[PDB]
């Protein structure tokens, strides 16, 4: 069993990267993939860069070159659900694009032609993540994560997301791209991220301040989840 892990930013992958034993580094297409064992389990960790296309490029390389059995997307997110504080965990049941609009041809808001309106995360990965949350006594929410190529910073950007996706629990910039690529290769995925900010007027200040705590909590979850999956 080989577990693929994807994060966008150096801060989001560095704790996991550090823990990999017998680490090898592949540099291809402007991204880096680190392979080796994480507490005895074979992993391939991708640092993709930021946004949908960087994520899509990276995930495609990871799937082609490493053939992981499952994909876990880790990192930070902007919290939208009202019980989420900085550091808390979000688990995708589904991912949708908040910025896709082909409604002129009668597609659902957020849906691209040839795609389901939302990409569903794997039930067994969701269950395993929730059992880790329980075992670690973390506060978490499971539900819809939305992605786009924008950093949400209150004002009209936040308002549009709340209007179109009132059920969305978090927002970020890669998860749905990863989900889309996994869907097209028929590879199971789950998003397990942690809250850095609440996507409001203060989100730019909060992000800087609390990225480290978000990277720490998400990385703790990914470690626990990898161990759980290896059994």
Ligand X SMILES: CSC[C@@H]1CN(Cc2c[nH]c3c(N)ncnc23)C[C@H]1O
Contact between 57 and ligand X per CB under 6 A: no
Question: Cβ neighbours of residue 114 under 8 Å, at least 6 residues apart?
Answer: none
- If the CB atoms of residues 4 and 148 are measured against a second copy, the closer one turns out to be 148
> CB within 8 A of 8, min separation 6: which ones?
47, 48, 49, 50, 51, 54, 55, 75, 173, 174
Coil, strand or helix: which one is 173? coil
Query: How distant, in Å, are the alpha carbons of 38, 100, 123, 124, 139 from that of 131?
Result: 19, 33, 12, 11, 12
CB–CB of 86/207 below 8 Å? no
Say how many residues touch ligand X, by CB under 6 A.
21
Q: How far is the CB of 108 from ligand X (least distance, A)?
A: 13
Backbone angles phi, psi at 90, to 5 degrees: -120, 135
Stretch that binds ligand X, among 59-67, 182-190, 196-204, 223-231 (CB under 6 A): 196-204
Q: Show contacts with a second copy in window 4-63 (CB under 8 A).
A: 29-31, 49-57, 60-61, 63
By the rule CB under 6 A, 165 interacts with ligand X: no
Residues 6 or more apart in contact with residue 205 via CB below 8 angstroms = none
Q: How far is the CB of 101 from ligand X (least distance, A)?
A: 10
Considering only 203, 217, 218, 224, the residue that binds a second copy (CB under 8 A) is: 203
Cα torsion 18, 24, 28, 33: sign: negative
Window 64-93: residues binding a second copy (CB under 8 A): 64
Check residue 177 for interaction with ligand X (CB under 6 A): no
Q: Does 212 bind a second copy (CB under 8 A)?
A: no
CB of 43 to a second copy, least distance (A): 21
Structure tokens, 38:
């994480």
Residues with active-site annotation: 12, 197
Tell me how far apart the alpha carbons of residues 129 and 115 are, in angstroms, rounded to a whole number: 26
Q: Which residues are annotated as a binding site for substrate?
A: 78, 152, 173-174
Q: Which of the choices a second copy, ligand X, none does residue 76 contact, using the CB cut-off of 5 to 8 A by kind?
A: ligand X
Span 70-129, contacts to ligand X by CB under 6 A: 75-78, 102, 105, 113
Contact footprint for a second copy (CB under 8 A): 29-31, 49-57, 60-61, 63-64, 97, 99-102, 104-105, 112-115, 148-151, 153, 157, 176-177, 180-181, 183-185, 203-204
């Amino acid at each position: 069993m080989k577990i693929g892990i994807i994060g966008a930013m150096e801060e989001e992958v560095t704790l996991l990267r550090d823990k990999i034993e017998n680490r090898q580094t592949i540099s291809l297409g402007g991204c880096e993939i680190y392979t080796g064992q994480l507490n005895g389990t074979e992993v391939a960790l991708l640092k993709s860069g930021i946004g949908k296309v960087a994520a899509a490029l990276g995930a495609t390389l990871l799937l082609e070159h490493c053939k992981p059995d499952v994909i876990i997307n880790t990192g930070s997110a902007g919290g939208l659900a009202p019980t989420l504080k900085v550091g808390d965990i979000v688990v995708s049941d589904e991912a949708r694009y908040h910025d896709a609009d082909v409604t002129a041809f009668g597609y659902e808001y957020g849906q691209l032609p040839g795609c389901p309106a939302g990409f569903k995360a794997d039930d067994k990965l969701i269950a395993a993540a929730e059992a880790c949350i329980a075992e670690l006594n973390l506060n978490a929410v499971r539900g819809l994560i939305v992605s786009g190529d924008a950093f949400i910073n209150g004002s009209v950007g936040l308002a549009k997301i709340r209007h179109n996706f009132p059920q969305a629990i978090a927002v970020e910039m890669e998860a749905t791209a990863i989900a889309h690529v996994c869907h097209n290769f028929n590879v199971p995925f789950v998003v397990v991220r942690a809250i850095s900010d609440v996507a409001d007027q203060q989100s730019h200040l909060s992000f800087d301040e609390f990225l480290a705590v978000a990277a720490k909590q998400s990385s703790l979850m990914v470690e626990s989840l990898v161990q759980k999956l290896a059994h």
